[PDB]
Design a protein around this ligand. Structure first.
Ligand SMILES: *[C@@H]1O[C@H](CO)[C@@H](O[C@@H]2O[C@H](CO)[C@@H](O)[C@H](O)[C@H]2NC(C)=O)[C@H](O)[C@H]1NC(C)=O
Ligand SMILES: *[C@@H]1O[C@H](CO)[C@@H](O[C@@H]2O[C@H](CO)[C@@H](O)[C@H](O)[C@H]2NC(C)=O)[C@H](O)[C@H]1NC(C)=O
Ligand SMILES: *[C@@H]1O[C@H](CO)[C@@H](O[C@@H]2O[C@H](CO)[C@@H](O)[C@H](O)[C@H]2NC(C)=O)[C@H](O)[C@H]1NC(C)=O
Ligand SMILES: *[C@@H]1O[C@H](CO)[C@@H](O[C@@H]2O[C@H](CO)[C@@H](O)[C@H](O)[C@H]2NC(C)=O)[C@H](O)[C@H]1NC(C)=O
Ligand SMILES: *[C@@H]1O[C@H](CO)[C@@H](O[C@@H]2O[C@H](CO)[C@@H](O)[C@H](O)[C@H]2NC(C)=O)[C@H](O)[C@H]1NC(C)=O
Ligand SMILES: *[C@@H]1O[C@H](CO)[C@@H](O[C@@H]2O[C@H](CO)[C@@H](O)[C@H](O)[C@H]2NC(C)=O)[C@H](O)[C@H]1NC(C)=O
Ligand SMILES: *[C@@H]1O[C@H](CO)[C@@H](O)[C@H](O)[C@H]1NC(C)=O
Ligand SMILES: *[C@@H]1O[C@H](CO)[C@@H](O)[C@H](O)[C@H]1NC(C)=O
Ligand SMILES: *[C@@H]1O[C@H](CO)[C@@H](O)[C@H](O)[C@H]1NC(C)=O
Ligand SMILES: *[C@@H]1O[C@H](CO)[C@@H](O)[C@H](O)[C@H]1NC(C)=O
Ligand SMILES: *[C@@H]1O[C@H](CO)[C@@H](O)[C@H](O)[C@H]1NC(C)=O
Lengths: 415, 80, 100, 49, 50, 40
């Protein structure tokens, strides 16, 4: 067997989009444009524009619903105590900074600065998001303060305070490592944690483009919209691409056909654009749902699903905002410095087979010890960390060794 | 009215000339709204507008910045 | 256009994953791979669902026989029924029909 | 209460598709087919292609 | 039509990736996520398109 | 909240009490001692 003897804390970045820009377009201004006869001709085509506007409004509302679902998950706005004595840990990078713009932490400011990007055109409009950036920062600050101060209890019911070096102490207890490991390596663990968070922002900044997805979606939208505008100057098999030219240079009965050709072309282009927007919004909503899930499981509690949050055994997570999405920082426990030993299924002493209550048997070459699975702290084999069952000869691979008893010497001295 | 420096609202019938110009005009990021009273205090979000304004009915109609919940600081100390 | 990853390479990935989960338990999914005897790993797997280890360590031969027999039956089950796949074929059929 | 006294290890199959055949279409050639008149006429329509 | 079908296939691929991460590389306590019964371990195999 | 007396069968020992910060002083009652005194 091979058992580790040391560990490293690590912090890992995850990025997810949650919403896109809300847009609105009306037909009459776009297809025809300040012309009465064009509108009269368009009126014969039915109710395309009502359903187009309805379809776009659906997405416009769904964006706000997505943001509300992913972020608004706390009943109250918590707040960190004025002093900072978190047992040697240091959250200055992630906590809000007052002597700065409104509320953003250093990492959030780096995120906003790194991400860089439409004006008023004919018939297009952009609606402002329902939640301003300050409110989003307030939500993230509330979540971070709650998880620093009160553990995961604030997720279930009412917030109950807990010392941080003591909540991490039995946050190890979740992944199978006993408490005393933390209480005896507190200083080293704190140093590793601080160093990792220090490294993360340099990792973000030095790499020219690691944001990726968050930027990517924006480009797509802009690109699509541009084509729509560039679709406006097309002859579509007619005399000219300007409505006024067509109407002025010819009689209405003749020019009606050209007007109809332009109508059909522009209507088809608008149809394609709306369909593309719907399909993209579906995928964005899927990503928003995944983000909301990850928020609920990983931020408000420890997780037992492998590789759901980071690589390695999971400890906790910290959220941060972004221009159109969220960034998680997962803190994980990774073993290292393994050493190899020889094992055995169960001891056979006094004709009875002894199994370990919790842990495995190891041997450095001559003697035998019982140790926990994820760390190496050997202990003498006693009769209270092992349990008896069955007979000796049934198990295959047993070994012979004495099992010490604690009560025997004490009654020996005091028979 | 959306995306208008609101001074231009009167330009564009029997009773509509009480919601043009008028007495109460509030200017927001989304546009300007006529018929509502700005209030300093804040409540939960009723009918939403945009950029953090939630109009509501109380006997009139008010327009206020949204609230995010009640403040609550946890008494945290290293041995409690 | 051709796929970026040739089929032999996909088979190599699957073989690597299978070897890793055979000879290292599941520690290779977190950090460095650590070896452990297979019956011991199965004992811990039992301990993880509320059955003590002696249950496995007394009935090792029976576990092995049931495991082998079940894997043997899987191949015949796949071979006999023609609708066993039933899902990968559907995508190919739909794509071919649409293109046609 | 009722408790068991024996067990049967079992194995089960699950199948999932992960990919579909990549493809592409020569947009102009499909519609026109190496005809100059068709190609010149298509430029009016715009950037659908 | 191709776009919609590709979206569906992407959903299936994401589900497969989650199953591979959570069941091949460790036990699972989610009921009926991997097999019917108490889960022990899984083994993968490739296929022409899955 | 079910307070209980700190015996020696619901707690475990590990090393001496210098490395940990925040250690307090108290006595851990042991159950076997009264019986041993009774019977010896
Ligand atoms: C576990 O690894 C850590 C480093 O990852 C070790 O800590 C280092 O110990 C050496 C001892 O010479 C020091 O020079 C380094 O400064 C330490 N690093 C840090 C970050 O403090 C630690 O000693 C290892 N565990 C054991 C038991 O040796
Ligand atoms: C927590 O970490 C922050 C940043 O890592 C520390 O702030 C820096 O402290 C160093 C100490 O010499 C100063 O030189 C810098 O000017 C500080 N600001 C920066 C880097 O922006 C902070 O002191 C740490 N807190 C504790 C209690 O150690
Ligand atoms: C295996 O571990 C045992 C337990 O510590 C070792 O036995 C003791 O080792 C210490 C360390 O030098 C000695 O001071 C003691 O005299 C040894 N005996 C006893 C009874 O404590 C043993 O040496 C180790 N073997 C190897 C190969 O490392
Ligand atoms: C553990 O100790 C027992 C007790 O001596 C060993 O059992 C003996 O094995 C020898 C080997 O031939 C026999 O001749 C004796 O008749 C056995 N006696 C009993 C009471 O079983 C056993 O072999 C030892 N096992 C190991 C692995 O050393
Ligand atoms: C549990 O069931 C298994 C079979 O599923 C039993 O093993 C069988 O035992 C009989 C009698 O010894 C043999 O004839 C069969 O060949 C065995 N089956 C296999 C697959 O080997 C087992 O006995 C049952 N458990 C108990 C305690 O009786
Ligand atoms: C807890 O008990 C220990 C053991 O008595 C105390 O440590 C000693 O306290 C006496 C009190 O005067 C000092 O003279 C000694 O120097 C201390 N050390 C040793 C090694 O005897 C300790 O002070 C008590 N209190 C706390 C908070 O630990
Ligand atoms: C395993 O340990 C043995 C000694 O117990 C050693 O000889 C061997 O090299 C080790 N295996 C490694 C390091 O792969
Ligand atoms: C381990 O394998 C070796 C291979 O030679 C064998 O001799 C030995 O008996 C095995 N040990 C156990 C406990 O099965
Ligand atoms: C509206 O116009 C006035 C004067 O033309 C100007 O002072 C004011 O800043 C404008 N409002 C906005 C929001 O730009
Ligand atoms: C609200 O605030 C404004 C300016 O901040 C102030 O003039 C006014 O008296 C306050 N109260 C009310 C009821 O408007
Ligand atoms: C708690 O913090 C105070 C600082 O006010 C310090 O004096 C005390 O020693 C700390 N307690 C522990 C157990 O570290």
């Amino acid at each position: 067997i091979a058992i580790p003897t040391n560990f490293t804390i690590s912090v890992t970045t995850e990025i997810l989009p949650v919403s896109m820009t809300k847009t609105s377009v009306d037909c009459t201004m776009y297809i025809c444009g300040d012309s009465t006869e064009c509108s009269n001709l368009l009126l014969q085509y039915g109710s395309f524009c009502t359903q187009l506007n309805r379809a776009l409004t659906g997405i416009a509302v769904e964006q706000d619903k997505n943001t509300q679902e992913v972020f608004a998950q706390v009943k109250q706005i918590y707040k960190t105590p004025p002093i900072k004595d978190f047992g040697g840990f240091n959250f200055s990078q992630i906590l809000p900074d007052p002597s700065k713009p409104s509320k953003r932490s250093p990492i959030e400011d780096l995120l906003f600065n790194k991400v860089t990007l439409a004006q008023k055109f004919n018939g297009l409009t952009v609606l402002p998001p329902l939640l301003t950036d300050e409110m989003i920062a307030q939500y993230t600050s509330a979540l971070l303060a709650g998880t620093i101060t009160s553990g995961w209890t604030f997720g279930a019911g009412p917030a109950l305070q807990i010392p941080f070096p003591m909540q991490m102490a039995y946050r190890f207890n979740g992944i199978g490592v006993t408490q005393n490991v933390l209480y005896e390596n507190q200083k080293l663990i704190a140093n590793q944690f601080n160093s990792a968070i220090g490294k993360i922002q340099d990792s973000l900044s030095s790499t020219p483009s690691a944001l990726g997805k968050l930027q990517d979606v924006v480009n797509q939208n802009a690109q699509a919209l541009n084509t729509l505008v560039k679709q406006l100057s097309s002859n579509f098999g007619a005399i000219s691409s300007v409505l006024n030219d067509i109407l002025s240079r010819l009689d209405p009965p003749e020019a009606e056909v050209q007007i109809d050709r332009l109508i059909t072309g522009r209507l088809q282009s608008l149809q394609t654009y709306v369909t593309q927007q719907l399909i993209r919004a579906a995928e964005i909503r899927a990503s928003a749902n995944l983000a909301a899930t990850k928020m609920s499981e990983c931020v408000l509690g420890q997780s037992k699903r492998v590789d759901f949050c980071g690589k390695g055994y999971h400890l906790m997570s910290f959220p941060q905002s972004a221009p159109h999405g969220v960034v998680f920082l997962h803190v994980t426990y990774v073993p290292a410095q393994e050493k190899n030993f020889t094992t055995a299924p169960a001891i056979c002493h006094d004709g009875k087979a002894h199994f370990p209550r919790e842990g495995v048997f190891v041997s450095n070459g001559t003697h035998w010890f019982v140790t926990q699975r994820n760390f190496y702290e050997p202990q003498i084999i006693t009769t209270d960390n092992t349990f008896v069952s069955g007979n000796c000869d049934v198990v295959i691979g047993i070994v012979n060794n004495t099992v010490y008893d604690p009560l025997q010497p004490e009654l020996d001295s005091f028979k | 009215y959306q995306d208008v420096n609101c001074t231009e609202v009167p330009v564009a019938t029997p009773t509509w000339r009480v919601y043009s110009t008028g007495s109460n005009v509030f200017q927001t990021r989304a546009g300007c709204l006529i018929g509502a009273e700005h209030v300093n205090n804040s409540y939960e979000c009723d009918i939403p507008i945009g950029a953090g304004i939630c109009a509501s009915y109380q006997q009139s109609i008010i327009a206020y910045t949204m609230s995010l919940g009640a403040e609550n600081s946890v008494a945290y100390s290293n041995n409690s």
